[PDB]
Design a protein around this ligand. Structure first.
Ligand SMILES: C[C@H](CC#CC(C)(C)O)[C@H]1CCC2/C(=C/C=C3C[C@@H](O)C[C@H](O)C3)CCC[C@@]21C
Length: 253
């Protein structure tokens, strides 16, 4: 059976599309306000050199910090999010922040050359730029594989925004108090997504798409864990805090 989207489900989708359009600038016009990207010579991918310089960290830290602010704005507009306690809202945002950034970044990722292209060549980020920020291939390679996999699903914008919302409102995050309420909120979003796919998404791949999307959420958890491990290592580097931002320090600290 392929039941039609209820008026409420249609409303949820409209609200999320609006939230995304207000919090994701497809022109990347604010990027010139971040600390400038610096790309030193490191064809050898020397960990020692990368850690001593962290040339791309200030720029990427600003980009990530800016993104967290946009994610906070998006989350506040998710139907039901405001009904949670502030304590639970913060737990959900802090635990999902890196995952939603990875998801939303798919919009600027291009399979033409496997990079995140955000306008001019100065704002084109490749694997080599991430290593210059202190991270290693143990995170980057799986990250790129994840981006290509997500890209290949060719999600409608409606599906893309529902996925980010579902990612944020997850009941199995450590520290949440009212898991039941959170689960209820997520279920409403999941049912909307499942109904949308069967009703609005044409073949091939009509079905199975939901399963593939859910698997991506599992993939994000692993990437989250690896990023946390690497962030810890990065925090050991003297004077690193100055290259980050207060928001980044709190969310990942
Ligand atoms: C591992 C990085 C995250 C980090 C970090 C620190 C340095 C804080 O550990 C990568 C996560 C995904 C990502 C990237 C995200 C890019 C997006 C630009 C635009 O799509 C708006 C998104 O909102 C942000 C590309 C360059 C490497 C990263 C910044």
């Amino acid at each position: 059976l392929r039941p039609k989207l209820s008026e409420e489900q249609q409303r949820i989708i409209a609200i999320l599309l609006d939230a995304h359009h207000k919090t994701y600038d497809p022109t990347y016009s604010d990027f010139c306000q971040f600390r400038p990207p610096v790309r030193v010579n490191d064809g050898g991918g020397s960990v020692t050199l990368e850690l001593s310089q962290l040339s791309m960290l200030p720029h990427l830290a600003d980009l990530v910090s800016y993104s967290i602010q946009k994610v906070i704005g998006f989350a506040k507009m998710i139907p039901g999010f405001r009904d949670l306690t502030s304590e639970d809202q913060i737990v959900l945002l802090k635990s999902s922040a890196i995952e939603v950034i990875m998801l939303r970044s798919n919009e600027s990722f291009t399979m033409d050359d496997m990079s995140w292209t955000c306008g001019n060549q100065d704002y084109k980020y490749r694997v080599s730029d991430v290593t210059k920020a202190g991270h290693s291939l143990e995170l980057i390679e799986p990250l790129i594989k994840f981006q290509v996999g997500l890209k290949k699903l060719n999600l409608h914008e409606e599906e893309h925004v529902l996925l980010m919302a579902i990612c944020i409102v997850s009941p199995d995050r450590p520290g949440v108090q009212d898991a039941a309420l959170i689960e209820a909120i997520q279920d409403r979003l999941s049912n909307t997504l499942q109904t949308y796919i069967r009703c609005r998404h044409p073949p091939p791949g009509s079905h199975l798409l939901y399963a593939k999307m859910i698997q991506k959420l599992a993939d994000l958890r692993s990437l989250n864990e690896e990023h946390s491990k690497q962030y810890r290592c990065l925090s050991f580097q003297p004077e690193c805090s100055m290259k980050l931002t207060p928001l980044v320090l709190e969310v990942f600290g």
